[PDB]
Design a protein around this ligand. Structure first.
Ligand SMILES: CC[C@@H](NC(=O)c1ccc(Cl)cc1)[C@H]1[C@@H]2C[C@@H](Oc3ccnc4ccccc34)C[C@@H]21
Ligand SMILES: CC[C@@H](NC(=O)c1ccc(Cl)cc1)[C@H]1[C@@H]2C[C@@H](Oc3ccnc4ccccc34)C[C@@H]21
Lengths: 375, 375
């Protein structure tokens, strides 16, 4: 894989060893971002952001410091917009934060809202660098509220991204085997991908130890929410000093994960084909991924179809191995639907989530229908 | 210099070189209807003739050129059938005999089952005399809808603009090689060469006034190019009988489906698809209405390093001037397009007892182009 796609041998689409501290110049951003639970509870978040001077982004020289700054400002933005998460909202992001956040956003080519790539892919650290990438040796950099289970939700997502990284590095082998007409290597490679996505499902299981349904639904979900098709901000958000009209941007989503999409693309499971809402949504989320990763996806599409290759050969072993990859994705979707019932639907029904359920039902359905032989 | 997998011709660029006029005998029934659309629509014979067709297999369309002609054929028939005489009586259902093969062929070519720019411009032409050049006077379209519809003018002037732009497309490898090799003089020359062709392409655009009449365009041709995405006349889309039980929405023909309309923006790092705006949304969506080879090309352009960041980093007035000349030439093309939309859509509409949408789209594209100036 070309290093120009920003994919790591070890952590895959995750930003390897993200930067924790910014330059001292940015101490005022860092303070607020580091103390969102405390500032929100004390009712001083909106006051502190308003007392900020407009800082230059020019001292953010490298990619990682720029990415750290995006996480910092995106979390501050979510805290500023949503407040205590009980309906009192702001519809104007002040210039002192809005301007540099948008400057930095345009430069990195992400929209100025917190995305998956901020709060999962850049939002982590090893505790001891020598010790391996395990939950106990890891931690998130930023959270919204005390008891929000943001560490669990984000790190468990990150660990799935990492798990899937072992499959990602096999992708080159697949197209090379196709180009070379090397059937045995193709078979071996597809089995290895299947094996890696199976492992990734076991990593997904860890969620239950680190996230409870009430804390996620009643708190965390709120702070990840966006302002595209949201009654609370019908027309979107005003980035004072940068854009004159309010702009709409979608909130965080698993559809923003590149591993959530790349294996569908690999296997010719045409998730973005046809006019359907799920397809549209999945394509739209490419623009919420970093450009290099967005580029990885559409360049996978430009390569020849693994599916048509496999369909044409009259080779049961190849078909089995292709199906094993597909089956593994079905399993990941099914497990996700279970997680959506426990963490969204049930909590919702108790008060005096369905779109995500149906979205995932469609994604699972499309995945399952791309099997060559039934699972 | 440009890979053949991207289906770009050196002479005609994104246009299908030397398009096919006649399909196999097996499809004489498709061809009779398509070649006589003016007579069959006016006389109200069109719909019955389509209705009495037998469902032909797409297996006998062997080569890409014949496969593309067949789309041009079925696409026009589909618009005729849907819109009829263009007076408001429409068909919410496309019959299985035509719909099944059109959908099967569409899936095969990775295009949606609706007439697109690549059908009715890039594949809808012939030379009168092969020995004489690619000029309006030596050329003809293959299919029109109605008498007096100016489809010759509208389609061929679009094609000639595509062809004029082809001169610049072949310089794209020079640009990327020059960056990689750190060849400043080559890059300057290359950018100036690109700006020269886009300036030329603007003068080719001026011909539209000689061959196209506002009334005829607005009241006749525009109706046959309309699709069924966000259209009050088919609110749920069209039923493709036999293929889907539910009606699917698809957008009508558009300049945003032209690959040259998009590719130089990408080249020059103008982020027309950035932000969550409507114009950016549309341009991305229209990539899936381009032939997949051309869709891929735009994707590989995106994935290459930024010409804009290169010119900006270098601190070189000459390079900046040569880059700005390319941007200035794109601005002029959008400005000219807007004047045409005023003449051909806005004014006619004012006299009649989504022109504003197309104007706003173009205004957003022009604005974004202007903002990429360096001076
Ligand atoms: C708490 C965990 C949950 N996380 C989120 O939903 C999430 C949502 C918004 C944000 Cl801002 C951050 C995280 C879960 C991760 C891993 C999950 O992986 C996958 C699911 C389904 N299919 C797949 C096919 C291939 C590869 C991975 C897949 C998606 C997502
Ligand atoms: C009647 C002509 C007009 N045609 C159409 O709008 C048209 C619309 C729908 C269909 Cl089904 C067929 C044609 C015009 C062509 C060439 C026009 O080129 C360009 C405009 C603006 N900017 C540009 C920047 C770079 C390169 C080309 C550009 C676009 C479009």
């Amino acid at each position: 894989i070309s290093k120009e796609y920003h994919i790591d041998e070890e952590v895959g689409f995750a930003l390897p060893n993200p930067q924790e501290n910014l330059p001292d110049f940015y101490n005022d951003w860092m303070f607020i971002a580091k103390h969102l639970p405390d500032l929100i509870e004390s009712g001083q978040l909106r006051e502190r952001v308003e007392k900020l001077n407009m800082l230059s982004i020019d001292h953010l020289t490298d990619h990682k410091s720029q990415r750290l700054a995006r996480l910092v400002l995106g979390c501050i933005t979510m805290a500023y917009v949503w407040g205590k998460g009980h309906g009192d909202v702001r519809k104007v992001l002040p210039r002192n934060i809005a301007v540099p956040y948008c400057q930095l956003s345009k430069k990195l080519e992400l929209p100025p809202i917190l995305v998956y790539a901020d709060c999962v892919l850049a939002n982590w650290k090893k505790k001891d660098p020598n010790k391996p990438l395990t939950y106990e040796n890891m931690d998130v950099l930023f959270s919204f509220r005390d008891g929000d289970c943001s560490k669990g939700f984000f790190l468990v997502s990150l660990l799935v991204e990492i798990a899937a990284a072992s499959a990602i590095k096999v992708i080159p082998t697949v197209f090379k085997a196709m180009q070379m007409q090397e059937r045995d290597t193709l078979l071996k490679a597809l089995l290895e991908i299947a094996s890696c996505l199976e492992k990734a499902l076991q990593v997904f299981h860890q969620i239950h130890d680190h996230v409870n349904p009430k804390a996620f639904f009643s708190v965390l979900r709120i702070y990840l929410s966006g302002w595209k098709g949201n009654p609370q901000l019908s027309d979107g958000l005003v980035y004072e000093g940068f854009w004159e009209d309010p702009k709409e941007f979608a909130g965080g989503s698993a559809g923003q994960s590149s591993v959530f999409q790349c294996f569908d693309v690999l296997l010719g499971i045409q998730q973005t084909a046809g006019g359907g809402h799920a397809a549209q949504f999945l394509q739209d989320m490419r623009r919420y991924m970093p450009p290099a990763h967005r580029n990885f996806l559409c360049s996978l599409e430009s390569n020849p179809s693994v599916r048509e290759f496999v369909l044409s050969k009259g080779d049961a072993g190849l078909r089995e191995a292709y199906d094993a990859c597909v089956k593994a994705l079905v399993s990941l979707r099914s497990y996700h639907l279970q997680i959506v019932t426990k963490y969204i639907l049930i909590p919702a029904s108790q008060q005096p989530g369905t779109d995500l359920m149906n979205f995932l039902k469609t994604v699972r359905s499309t995945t399952e229908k791309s099997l060559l032989k039934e699972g």
